[PDB]
Amino acid sequence: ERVVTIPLRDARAEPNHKRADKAMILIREHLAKHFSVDEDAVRLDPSINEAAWARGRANTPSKIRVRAARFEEEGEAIVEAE
Amino acid sequence: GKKSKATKKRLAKLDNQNSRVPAWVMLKTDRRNHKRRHWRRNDTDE
Amino acid sequence: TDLSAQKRLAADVLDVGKNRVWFNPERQGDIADAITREDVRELVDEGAIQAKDKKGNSRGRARERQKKRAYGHQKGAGSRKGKAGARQNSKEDWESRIRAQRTKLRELRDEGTLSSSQYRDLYDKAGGGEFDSVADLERYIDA
Amino acid sequence: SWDVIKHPHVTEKAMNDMDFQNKLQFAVDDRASKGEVADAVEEQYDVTVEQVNTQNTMDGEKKAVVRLSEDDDAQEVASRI
Amino acid sequence: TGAGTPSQGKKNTTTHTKCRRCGEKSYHTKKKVCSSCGFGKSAKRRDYEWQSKAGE
RNA sequence: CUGUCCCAACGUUGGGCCCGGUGAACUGUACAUUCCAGUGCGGAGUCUGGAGACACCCAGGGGGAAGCGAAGACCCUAUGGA
RNA sequence: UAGGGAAACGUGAUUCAACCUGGGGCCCAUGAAAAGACGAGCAUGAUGUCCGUACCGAGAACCGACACAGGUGUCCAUGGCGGCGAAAGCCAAGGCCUGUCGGGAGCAACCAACGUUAGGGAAUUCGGCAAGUUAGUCCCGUACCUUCGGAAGAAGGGAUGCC
RNA sequence: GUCGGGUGAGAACCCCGACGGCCUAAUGGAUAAGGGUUCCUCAGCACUGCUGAUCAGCUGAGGGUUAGCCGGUCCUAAGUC
RNA sequence: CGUGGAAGUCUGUUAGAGUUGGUGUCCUACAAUACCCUCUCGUGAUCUAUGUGUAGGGGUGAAAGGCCCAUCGAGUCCGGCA
RNA sequence: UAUGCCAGCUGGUGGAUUGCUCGGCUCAGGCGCUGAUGAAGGACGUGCCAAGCUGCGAUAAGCUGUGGGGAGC
Numbered sequence A: 001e002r003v004v005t006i007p008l009r010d011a012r013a014e015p016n017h018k019r020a021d022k023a024m025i026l027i028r029e030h031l032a033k034h035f036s037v038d039e040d041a042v043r044l045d046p047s048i049n050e051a052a053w054a055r056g057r058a059n060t061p062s063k064i065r066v067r068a069a070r071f072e073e074e075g076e077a078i079v080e081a082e
Numbered sequence B: 001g002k003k004s005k006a007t008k009k010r011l012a013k014l015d016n017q018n019s020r021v022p023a024w025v026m027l028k029t030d031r032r033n034h035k036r037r038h039w040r041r042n043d044t045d046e
Numbered sequence C: 001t002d003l004s005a006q007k008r009l010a011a012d013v014l015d016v017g018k019n020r021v022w023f024n025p026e027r028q029g030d031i032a033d034a035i036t037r038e039d040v041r042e043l044v045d046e047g048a049i050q051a052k053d054k055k056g057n058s059r060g061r062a063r064e065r066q067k068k069r070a071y072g073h074q075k076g077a078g079s080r081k082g083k084a085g086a087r088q089n090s091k092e093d094w095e096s097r098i099r100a101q102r103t104k105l106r107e108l109r110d111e112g113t114l115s116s117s118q119y120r121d122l123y124d125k126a127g128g129g130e131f132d133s134v135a136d137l138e139r140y141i142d143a
Numbered sequence D: 001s002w003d004v005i006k007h008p009h010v011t012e013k014a015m016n017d018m019d020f021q022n023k024l025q026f027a028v029d030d031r032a033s034k035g036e037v038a039d040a041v042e043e044q045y046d047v048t049v050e051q052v053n054t055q056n057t058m059d060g061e062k063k064a065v066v067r068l069s070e071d072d073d074a075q076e077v078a079s080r081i
Numbered sequence E: 001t002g003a004g005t006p007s008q009g010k011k012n013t014t015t016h017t018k019c020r021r022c023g024e025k026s027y028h029t030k031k032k033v034c035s036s037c038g039f040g041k042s043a044k045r046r047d048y049e050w051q052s053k054a055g056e
Numbered sequence F: 001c002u003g004u005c006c007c008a009a010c011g012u013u014g015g016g017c018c019c020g021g022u023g024a025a026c027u028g029u030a031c032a033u034u035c036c037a038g039u040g041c042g043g044a045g046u047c048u049g050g051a052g053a054c055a056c057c058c059a060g061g062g063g064g065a066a067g068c069g070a071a072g073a074c075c076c077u078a079u080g081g082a
Numbered sequence G: 001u002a003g004g005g006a007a008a009c010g011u012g013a014u015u016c017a018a019c020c021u022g023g024g025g026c027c028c029a030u031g032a033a034a035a036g037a038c039g040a041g042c043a044u045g046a047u048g049u050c051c052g053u054a055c056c057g058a059g060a061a062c063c064g065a066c067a068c069a070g071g072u073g074u075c076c077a078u079g080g081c082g083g084c085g086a087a088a089g090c091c092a093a094g095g096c097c098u099g100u101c102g103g104g105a106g107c108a109a110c111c112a113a114c115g116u117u118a119g120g121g122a123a124u125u126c127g128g129c130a131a132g133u134u135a136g137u138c139c140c141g142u143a144c145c146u147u148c149g150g151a152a153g154a155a156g157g158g159a160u161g162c163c
Numbered sequence H: 001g002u003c004g005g006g007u008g009a010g011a012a013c014c015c016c017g018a019c020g021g022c023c024u025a026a027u028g029g030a031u032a033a034g035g036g037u038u039c040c041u042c043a044g045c046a047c048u049g050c051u052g053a054u055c056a057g058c059u060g061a062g063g064g065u066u067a068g069c070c071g072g073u074c075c076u077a078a079g080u081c
Numbered sequence I: 001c002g003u004g005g006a007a008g009u010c011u012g013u014u015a016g017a018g019u020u021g022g023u024g025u026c027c028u029a030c031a032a033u034a035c036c037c038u039c040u041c042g043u044g045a046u047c048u049a050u051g052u053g054u055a056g057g058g059g060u061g062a063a064a065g066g067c068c069c070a071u072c073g074a075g076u077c078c079g080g081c082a
Numbered sequence J: 001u002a003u004g005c006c007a008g009c010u011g012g013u014g015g016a017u018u019g020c021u022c023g024g025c026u027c028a029g030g031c032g033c034u035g036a037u038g039a040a041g042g043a044c045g046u047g048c049c050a051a052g053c054u055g056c057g058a059u060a061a062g063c064u065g066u067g068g069g070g071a072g073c
C-alpha cells in the first residue's frame, strides 16, 4: 500500500468532450504498471470516478492523489481517492 | 381508428390463425405455418 | 435481475416520476421477488423503495433583482431590449391617466368645490388631453 | 337454436372477482343481451343476478361479468360445477 | 414537395375494405361500390370477357 | 468589411489509419510487370522492333484501360409513332 | 366528524388563460341547417338494451419495400430566470442516455464541418460566389424624388454596466 | 457516457446506485387517423435487432379491454344512394 | 396636440406556409427529391384537418403543356395481341 | 521456396443427369341446367388436444331410414 500521484496530461490526446473517459483509463493503466498487476484486476472506488468527472466530461484535473492497496493469491489492487 | 363488431371478429380470427402448428401434428405426419402474418411486416385487410 | 417492471409500479404507487424512484442496491433480490403492488407498498414502508425530492428553481437571485428594479435601478438604456411602446403600452397609460383625472373631478363635484359648469369645462378639456397628470389638473384649477 | 351460456370463464382475474366481489364470469353468445345473460344464469344455477357487464373479447366471443346478490355465494356456485 | 416519398406520408384514408358480398378487399367505403364484384353498382356479378384471353 | 486573392499557417470536432464484431455492391471474353517507337479499320498492356522487368503486401492522389454507368437526346435514315 | 395528506391541513394581494357579459368598426364579402331543449310542478318505484373501450400515435407500433434523418391533424400558447416576445440562452416537472456497434494511435496524408491568422484589402472571380461587416434600446438628426401615402431605421452623431 | 454492484455458461451496451449528460410546442402529457394484439406475465434466443444480449415491438404459451350520464347511436351540412 | 386603430401595411425561424443562394453535404443516399446554413411570406387573393364534388381526348389549371397515387404533349389495368 | 499456375485425389457446396410419377396436355364416348321451398359465391363458426386443407352448420369431420359392407373404426 502507498499513495501515488497519477499525471492525467495524456488525456489531452483524446478529444476534449471525452477527457473524463480517457482519464479513467489512464488511472487503471498507471496502477497496473506501478503495482505490477493486470488492468482487469485494478478496482477503482467510485470516489476516483467522482473526482475525475467533477467539472464535467471535458475539464479533468491534470493530476490526482490516489491511495492503492495490493493483495490476494492471483493479485489485485483496490484503489481510492484521498 | 374505431372498429365495428364484425371487424373485431375478423381481426380476432386473424390473430388465432397466427398460432403455430401444434407439436402433435409433427409426430402424426412424421414431419410449417405458411400463413404467418406479423403486425408490422405483413398487412391485413380493410 | 431486471427491476424495470417494479420501477413502473413504484412510480405509480408513490405517484412520482420513474426517474425519481430510488431502489436500495443492497435489497435488489427482495425487490426482484416483488410481483404485486402490495409487495411494492410493503417495500415502501420498509424504506427500500423511496421517492427522491423534486427540484425547484431558486427565486432568490430574482428577488434581489426585483427589489432593485422596484427601487428604479438596473433599468438603464443598456438593459432595455424592447421598444418604448412595448415596455409601457400607450393606450393603457392613457386609460390609467384619464380614469384618474375623471375620478378626481368626480370627487370635487360631490365635495362642492366645483360646480356642474366648471366640472363640464374641465372634463371636456381632460378628454381633449390638456392635462398630463392629476397634479397638472390641480395646478390648472388653482388659478 | 343457440344457447346463451357457452362455458364459465375461469382465469386469475375471474377468481379475484369471485373471491372478493361475488362476481361470476361467463363466456356467452355474442347475440345475447345483458338481460338475457341475467335470466339464463338465474335459471341454470338458481341464484339472483344483480348486474351484468358485457365485453366483446378479441377471441370473437362475448365475456359477461355477472354479479350475484348477498344471499348467494359465488365461490360455492363455482365449486359445484 | 416531392411526389414520391414525402407524399406517401399523407396516406391514412381508408377506402377499399372487405366486401359483404364477395369477400375481397375491394369495397370502396366512400363510393359504397365494390371494384371486384360490382356490389353496390349491380345486382349481377362483375365479370368481363377481357379477364381472360380472347380464345379462352 | 473581410483568408476571395497575395500565400499560406496553426488549431477544433467527425472521419480517415490499426484492432474486435457485423458485412454488401458496381464490375469480370481471355491472357495481363510494363515503357518508347512503329504497324494495324488511320486513337494497341496483347501485333513488330527494341528498352525495362525478382515475387508479394500497405497507404495515396486518380495518368491510362479511347475506365464504369445509359442499345446517343445531336445528325441522317425508316413508304416509324405521337 | 366525504376524500386525501407524514405534517401543517393559511390569509390577504396583484396580474389575471378558461368561462361570463358589453361598446365600437368593416363588407361591390352579409357570415349553416335540422333534431332537440325551454316555455310547462313535485313524490315514490321501475327501466336505461346494443356497438367501441387493450396498446402505439412515431428519429422502432401510422404511410414511405426497412426498427427509413422523409411525411403525418388536434388540445396542453400561463412551469422559473430572461426579454417586447409562444425569441435566444439556462433550468424545473416529466422523459431519456435507443437520432443504438465498439477498442486504439498528440491521432500522419487527405476530406467534412469550423476557430484564429501579420501587412495589404476584391489584387480573387463571369460575378464579392463564400465569408464577413452592421446589429437590440434611447436621444439628436435626416437628402433627391413623390401618386403627398411614402422616401425613412435614409444617411450621420451621441448614449448604454454596477453601486 | 463512467465507477462500482446485480443476474447469468457468457455482459461495453439487461438491471441497481452514484457521478456525468441530453430533450422544454418537445425527446414531456392527452388524442385523430392509420396499425391490429404490437398491451401484461412467464419461458426462450433458431429468426428479427446496423456489433453483443441474459434484453426486446423477436419466438412460444397464457392473460388482458366491464359504461343510463365518454364516444357511437339521433340530427341535419356540402353531397350520395 | 391628443384620441382612434385602419392596412392583399411593416419587423418577426410565434405557430404555420414557402424554397433564393451555397451550383455546400449526399449522389450503390438517411431519402427513387434527403441534410445543413442562407433566404421569402406570415390578418390574408392567408395556412390547415376532415368530409364532399369534377375522370381520361375527359377533369383541373392566377397557364408551367402544370397536375389527375414515384405514371401525363393524353392516367392506370386487362383485353384486342403472338 | 512464399503469394501462386495446371491436372488429379478425399471431402464439401450445388442440384444437373439417370431412373420413378399422386400432376398436366389432347382426343373420344356419355351426360347436362340451378335459384325467393333463398341459388351459386362469400363470412364466421364446428374437433379432447386443432394452425392449414377437406367436411360439416349451434344437431356443425356430423343425426335418421333402407339397401350394400364387414371386424374393425
Ligand SMILES: [Cl-]
Residues within 6 Å of the ligand: G023
Ligand atoms: Cl364600453
Ligand SMILES: [Cl-]
Residues within 6 Å of the ligand: H071
Ligand atoms: Cl371514443
Ligand SMILES: [Mg+2]
Residues within 6 Å of the ligand: B015
Ligand atoms: Mg396470441
Ligand SMILES: [Mg+2]
Residues within 6 Å of the ligand: C090, C091
Ligand atoms: Mg397607439
Ligand SMILES: [Mg+2]
Residues within 6 Å of the ligand: D054, D055
Ligand atoms: Mg360495452
Ligand SMILES: [Mg+2]
Residues within 6 Å of the ligand: F071, F072
Ligand atoms: Mg442508337
Ligand SMILES: [Mg+2]
Residues within 6 Å of the ligand: none
Ligand atoms: Mg430533333
Ligand SMILES: [Mg+2]
Residues within 6 Å of the ligand: none
Ligand atoms: Mg404522324
Ligand SMILES: [Mg+2]
Residues within 6 Å of the ligand: G060, G067
Ligand atoms: Mg431506430
Ligand SMILES: [Mg+2]
Residues within 6 Å of the ligand: none
Ligand atoms: Mg490579414
Ligand SMILES: [Mg+2]
Residues within 6 Å of the ligand: none
Ligand atoms: Mg453572399
Ligand SMILES: [Mg+2]
Residues within 6 Å of the ligand: none
Ligand atoms: Mg423477460
Ligand SMILES: [Mg+2]
Residues within 6 Å of the ligand: none
Ligand atoms: Mg379536400
Ligand SMILES: [Mg+2]
Residues within 6 Å of the ligand: none
Ligand atoms: Mg412552350
Ligand code: NA
Residues within 6 Å of the ligand: B038, B039, B040, B041, B042, B043, B044, H035
Ligand atoms: Na401492418
Ligand code: NA
Residues within 6 Å of the ligand: D027, D061
Ligand atoms: Na371458448
